[PDB]
């Protein structure tokens, strides 16, 4: 009866910063996954606990579609059981993940000649994120025992850093748009289906 709204995610003009990653909840709709996987276009397309060519035969209770921009270097961190600045402090997948990670080079939308400083990531954090946790705190990071009182200085660092996306960056330092599809199947009713 309803067509799934994944297009809001894949065709969005601008993507979220990874620390403030977007999540769209998909429910009560049908979708044709072959439109997604038969478009080439993807530098990464890896699934866990599901097969892509099987997806059209499946129904799920909900589907989550998380999206954000990270550096090409870092796409390897969007996978179960990883570590690094992205997996630890920005976007973490659980060990028992069932879903697909999808990425494509976005150098020509997301990079700009003098640097696009609009995409950010979290550099400083006291502990690792839980799976699917989203921390948007902008509090000054206290690296010593003296309070920072909202002032940057020694031992007091703004926790987020800007990517510097310039089109001349090496491919590993170029922006990549990532979409993480999660396939949640609680119980009834499974209302997100293939044709």
């Amino acid at each position, epitope marked *: 009866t309803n067509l799934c709204p994944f297009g809001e995610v894949f065709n969005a003009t601008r993507f979220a910063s990874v620390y403030a990653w977007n999540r769209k909840r998909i429910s009560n709709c049908v979708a044709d996954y072959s439109v997604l996987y038969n478009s080439a276009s993807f530098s990464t397309f890896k699934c866990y606990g599901v097969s892509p060519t099987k997806l059209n035969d499946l129904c799920f209770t909900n589907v989550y579609a998380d999206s954000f921009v990270i550096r090409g*270097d870092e796409v390897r961190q969007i996978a179960p059981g990883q*570590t*690094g600045k992205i997996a*630890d*402090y920005n976007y973490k997948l659980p060990d028992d993940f069932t879903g697909c990670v999808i990425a494509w080079n976005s150098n020509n939308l997301d990079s700009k000649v003098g640097g696009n400083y609009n995409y950010l990531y979290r*550099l*400083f*954090r*006291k*502990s*690792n994120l839980k799976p699917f946790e989203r921390d948007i705190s902008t509090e000054i*990071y*206290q*690296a*010593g*025992s003296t309070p920072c009182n909202g002032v940057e200085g*020694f*031992n007091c*660092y703004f926790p987020l*850093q800007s990517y*510097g996306f310039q089109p*001349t*960056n*090496g491919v590993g*330092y170029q922006p990549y748009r990532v979409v993480v599809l999660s396939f949640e199947l609680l119980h009834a009713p499974a209302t997100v289906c293939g044709p």
Partner: antibody
């Protein structure tokens, strides 16, 4: 603000040692922390990194032999070194890592001599 | 991985002259991670520059950094006697890595 390493000394090949790095003025457990070593008349060699959140990374020359850790109650960073080899002979420094802002605080080091 | 090579191996200059030290990366790299360090004999390294061009707090005005892509430069505009020492550049992949160092020595 200080980092002070200790625990280095003489050890025989195959043996093991534990280095300590006592911080003052930085909180070890809240920082990226590194061990960086320097053999006689050689350059700097990064050896081990520990994240605030606990992830660890190792130089290929020490993987399977070294282990970086810390003790929060003592504000102290450790380097456990097993299966020590002659080429591990060096001054071992600990340093606080700010990544995009470089390694700003360094200790004076502790000397490890691997020899039979 | 990232491999940093410094040039020259030894730089020979006189007080008041201009020193220019080169650091070349084996691969294009982000300028945000490139730091320079000074080491005097028997002493721990001292951070001079971070992010390829930002001075560390307390570092004299004559120390200057620049570059992009694979080619980065430390410039000491007017050498004081205490500037004669070893200098290392550093980059970062998943972990720090160091160039092999340039020795700055007194010309005679």
């Amino acid at each position: 603000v200080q980092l002070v390493e200790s625990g280095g000394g003489l050890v025989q090949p195959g043996g093991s040692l534990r280095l300590s790095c006592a911080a003052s003025g930085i909180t070890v457990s809240s920082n990226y922390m590194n061990w960086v070593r320097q053999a006689p008349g050689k350059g700097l060699e990064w050896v081990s990194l520990i994240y605030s959140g606990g992830s660890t990374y190792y130089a290929d020359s020490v993987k399977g032999r070294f282990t970086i850790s810390r003790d929060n109650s003592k504000n102290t960073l450790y380097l456990q070194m097993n299966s020590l080899r002659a080429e591990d002979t060096a001054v071992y420094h600990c340093a606080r890592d700010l990544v995009v802002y470089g390694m700003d605080v360094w200790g004076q080091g502790t000397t490890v001599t691997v020899s039979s | 991985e990232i491999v940093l090579t410094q040039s020259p191996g030894t730089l020979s200059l006189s007080p008041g002259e201009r020193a220019t030290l080169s650091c070349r990366a084996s691969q294009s790299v982000s300028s945000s991670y490139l730091a320079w360090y000074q080491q005097k004999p028997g002493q721990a390294p001292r951070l001079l520059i971070y992010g390829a061009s930002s001075r560390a707090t307390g570092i004299p005005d004559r120390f200057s950094g620049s570059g992009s892509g694979t080619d980065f430069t430390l410039t000491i505009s007017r050498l004081e006697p205490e500037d004669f020492a070893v200098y290392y550049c550093q980059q970062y992949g998943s972990s720090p890595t160091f160039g092999q160092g340039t020795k700055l020595e007194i010309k005679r």
